[PDB]
Homo-oligomer: 225 residues x 3
Amino acid sequence: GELAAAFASVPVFPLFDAAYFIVSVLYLKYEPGAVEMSRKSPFASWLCAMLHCFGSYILADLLLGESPIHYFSNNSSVILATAVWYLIFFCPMNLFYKCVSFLPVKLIFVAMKEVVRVRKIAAGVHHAHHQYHHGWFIMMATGWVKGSGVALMSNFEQLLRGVWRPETNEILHMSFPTKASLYGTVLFTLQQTHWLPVSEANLVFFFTMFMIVCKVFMTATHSHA
Amino acid sequence: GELAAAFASVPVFPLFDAAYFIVSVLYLKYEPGAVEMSRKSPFASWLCAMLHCFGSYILADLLLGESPIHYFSNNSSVILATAVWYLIFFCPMNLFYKCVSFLPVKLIFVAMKEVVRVRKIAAGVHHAHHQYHHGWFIMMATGWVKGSGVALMSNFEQLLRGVWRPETNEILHMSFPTKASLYGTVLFTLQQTHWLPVSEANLVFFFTMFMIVCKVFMTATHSHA
Amino acid sequence: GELAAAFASVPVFPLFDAAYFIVSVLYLKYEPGAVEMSRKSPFASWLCAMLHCFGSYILADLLLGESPIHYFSNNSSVILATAVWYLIFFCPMNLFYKCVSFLPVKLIFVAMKEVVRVRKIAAGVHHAHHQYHHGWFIMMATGWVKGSGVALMSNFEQLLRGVWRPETNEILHMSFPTKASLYGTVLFTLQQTHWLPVSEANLVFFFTMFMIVCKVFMTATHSHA
Ligand SMILES: [Cl-]
Ligand SMILES: [Cl-]
Ligand SMILES: [Cl-]
Ligand SMILES: [Cl-]
Ligand SMILES: [Cl-]
Ligand SMILES: [Cl-]
């Protein structure tokens, strides 16, 4: 029991948050036109990176009536994400991008990102429960957007880049992390209702291992291995 | 006077809310691609039904700075709307859809829906007045979105379905219920300013009768009768 | 020092606000289809004028979790903007439009509008500082949207008019007032951090003179002079 309690209480800042930022900004760099956008519109590229890094907090704040940029009061967290964005886009002489994009190192940051994703899902359900004790649909919605993040607002992340693809969206066709966050927010909600006979730390540990194995396998298979 | 006081104080839950949900989900089913969407993207179809059922509360909460999903704390109300959505889309062996879509029965639910629409317009003006005693434009805006509902956000209801028709919107070209809600929110605001020499229950009664006669006639004429 | 204190404390209502409304509605009238929109959809034209007049307050309220229409409790301010919208669009027999659009008179209102823009940038940083003492990114974001105004939501101002041009936006390609508001909100934030060794009234005075000279020159040069 001590292993599940220690695994579910590790400080995510700054190492696990940096891994979350690295993977998110790497995905941004591989989007069509992102490199050219960072040179012609550097501010819009930075703002796009902030959406990838903190979109889950923006979305949760929007759903609960809090300031959508409330999370940007975390100065050192925003500065850390900005440094990741700068090193990946404007530092060819720096070994940072080549190291973090190296697949063995990249798979470690993918696993650490899943640790942050599961913690954010649980915190969303817990925070929504604090405001609505028996509001099950509010808990599920809050935990879902904390896990999915920028994927649910992808239509407007594209709009910021000058792209408009209204034929599809993350709700009409869910990817794996969005669908997995939906199953995850239901399990964490049922754990709050005491109908799920599982401890909270055991669910955080087991669901994180499920997300780590799936994401590491998908990232390695997507790289043809 | 007792008839207007009893008509304007009938509990809308659950019968009048169910009639509101039935008519709203029926309109959703007749939209292009809705049946295919409910089979390929059942969650997006459900979320689209929630926008049709509770869009007026989402919009009013957005205008006043409240949580946009605050109304989803009403568990039994959300569950009731979900049951209407399920019976209309995934129950061909159940006599529910054929009965509620039968035109004589459908016209009764259309009339009951207008009872709910007028009550929501008045409650929007009253609630906005409680926060802004002499904020006339806030009262009118709040009562308008409580009456119009999902129509004012139709461009983004279409976006959820993969449709984008930016050439028109409900503000640029108002339909009858949106235009009637605009006239209704002005009358209820003037009744709050005491410049309109009419009782509050008399205005609820008379304006509901106006909406019932118009909506029943339009629904029957639209069916070629 | 008394000149900078008197220049930065002049009541903007109603004269300086009227100049802000006149220039904003004039820009609206010169947009493609605006005159035809005011005749076929007068309410949508009015709502579009309100976005041009009060979009900076709507955007700031959205960023900080306040009611997006909170500024519409200022009745006399909304009525004043409505009168400017009515005189410019529906009064050909009235000398108002021809006088305010006359270039020498128009350049005076352009200068007075810049006085209001700088005051709104400073008030945005000050108000965000009141809620977040050391939230630098929240102060900069709040002051930026107070200065840029409707430009940052131009994609949805176009959507209200039935126009959709997703290839560009005000963030991907900043115009001068949006870019100048970004530099302005940084200077006013640094003045709040006490790292900028300049008085608050001296920064308001000098930055307003910079915006007046730039905007008057651009408006006169754009008219080929
Ligand atoms: Cl900090
Ligand atoms: Cl590469
Ligand atoms: Cl309940
Ligand atoms: Cl049928
Ligand atoms: Cl007033
Ligand atoms: Cl002219």
